[PDB]
């Protein structure tokens, strides 16, 4: 016929996503307008628990929502190649939005296009210009040496130097400043190499890596309760004042200037991963890797409310909405940037564009159970109950594993 029933999964739960799910919904009740019979019914669900368990089983199972956040990399690769993504070619012709965005290589297999970036993101240091001051620190650190010092200024004052909120199953957390550590230690292409056999995660620079992760922790400069907090306590330890720094995505700005949360608004700056002075200076970690991807198992009346839901999410005034107004790097060319952008908006986008150039997470470039191991791992290195060595080896071991079985 007819009218259908489409399950929308997203991962905006958190009160500081309340700006993305509203935009969400509005998206949404545009869409039900146009499409007579269509209705979508919105399952928002935690980051970990959709990525690593309810959107894994039900991959498992053949049995995806029909519209699902989803990410580029080794998750839609399995997805895509399993059969359970809706190829999206044909759809972004129709739309005219086939040229539109600034990459799809993450979603793309063998030149289909199995899911859409919503915005984009990039890693870096949030950081308190006051608590900075405090210490001695007038600058941003460019470097490592300029990093460790602030970073023994900060502890001489009693501040605590870096937020991080790495408990509970929030390893991924810690993953984000380990993640440009070992890039910075080992080189870009290093992550790249794991899965290709070409490289591996004993190689002396990774470990470099994890013994610098180790050693921020012992020194104190991690927050000495990171496991004793979920990911957005860490982000609130720094955004109430309590912490000087805070390595996050740019998908933290939000709660970050969040009026009702926030003491810092004032005062905050931003700065990249420091340089140490070999392959990866000057880099950011960052690209297009997160939006939503499609079940392939639609009949044709899911097919018609997918693709307009795809054309009422990915516009550029929606996309716009979501910069101005949650601080979301545009997965989309042509997007203007808003008026009166606070000193922060203007610093993470200077951090992007001088850039030489963006190296992905590591989760796009390594399988599901890698990941997870790393996720348990430095859990471990941060608690006392992990060597640096043993944390390598442990990797290893996983990474050969799955590169035999695929
Ligand atoms: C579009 C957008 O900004 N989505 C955000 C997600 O990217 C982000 O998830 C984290 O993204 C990193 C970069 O792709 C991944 O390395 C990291 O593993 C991933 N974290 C998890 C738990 O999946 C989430 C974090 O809550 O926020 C989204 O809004």
Aim: aromatic share 10%; proline share 4%.
């Amino acid at each position: 016929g007819d009218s259908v029933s489409l399950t929308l999964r997203h991962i905006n739960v958190r009160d500081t996503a309340k700006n993305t799910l509203a935009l969400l919904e509005k998206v949404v009740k545009k869409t039900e307008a146009e499409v007579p019979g269509a209705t979508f019914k919105l399952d928002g669900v935690e980051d970990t628990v959709n990525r690593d368990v309810k959107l894994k089983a039900e991959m498992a199972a053949g049995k995806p929502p029909q519209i699902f956040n989803l990410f580029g990399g080794a998750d839609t690769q399995n997805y895509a190649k399993a059969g359970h993504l809706l190829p999206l070619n044909d759809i972004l012709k129709e739309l005219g939005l086939e040229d539109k965005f600034f990459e799809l290589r993450e979603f793309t297999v063998d030149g289909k296009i199995y899911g859409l970036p919503e915005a984009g993101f990039v890693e870096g240091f949030y950081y308190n210009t006051k608590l900075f001051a405090d210490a001695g620190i007038t600058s941003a650190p460019k470097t490592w040496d300029e990093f460790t010092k602030a970073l023994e200024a900060l502890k001489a004052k009693n501040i605590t130097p870096i937020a991080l909120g790495g408990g509970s199953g929030d390893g991924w957390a810690i993953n984000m400043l380990a993640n440009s550590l070992f890039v910075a230690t080992a080189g870009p292409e290093a992550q790249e190499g794991f899965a290709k056999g070409t490289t591996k995660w004993t190689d002396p620079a990774v470990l470099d890596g994890f013994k610098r992760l180790k050693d921020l922790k012992d020194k104190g400069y991690i927050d000495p309760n990171v496991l004793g907090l979920k990911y957005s306590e860490g982000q609130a330890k720094f955004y109430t004042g309590q912490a000087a720094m805070l390595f996050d995505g740019s998908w933290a700005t939000s709660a970050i200037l969040d009026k009702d949360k926030s003491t810092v608004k004032d005062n905050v700056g931003y700065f990249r991963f420091p340089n140490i002075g070999g392959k990866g200076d000057n880099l950011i970690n960052g690209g297009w890797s997160n939006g939503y991807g499609f079940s392939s198992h639609l009949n044709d009346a899911e097919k018609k409310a997918v693709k307009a839901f795809i054309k009422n999410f990915y516009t550029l005034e929606i996309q716009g909405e979501a910069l101005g107004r949650d601080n979301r790097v545009p997965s989309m060319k042509g997007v203007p940037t808003p008026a009166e952008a606070a000193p922060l908006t203007k610093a993470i986008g200077e951090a992007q564009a001088s850039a030489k150039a963006a190296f992905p997470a590591f989760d796009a470039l390594v399988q599901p159970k890698v990941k997870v191991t790393l996720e348990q791992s430095v859990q471990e290195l941060l608690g006392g109950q992990l060597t640096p060595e043993k944390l390598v080896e442990k990797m290893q071991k996983v990474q050969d594993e799955a590169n035999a079985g695929k």
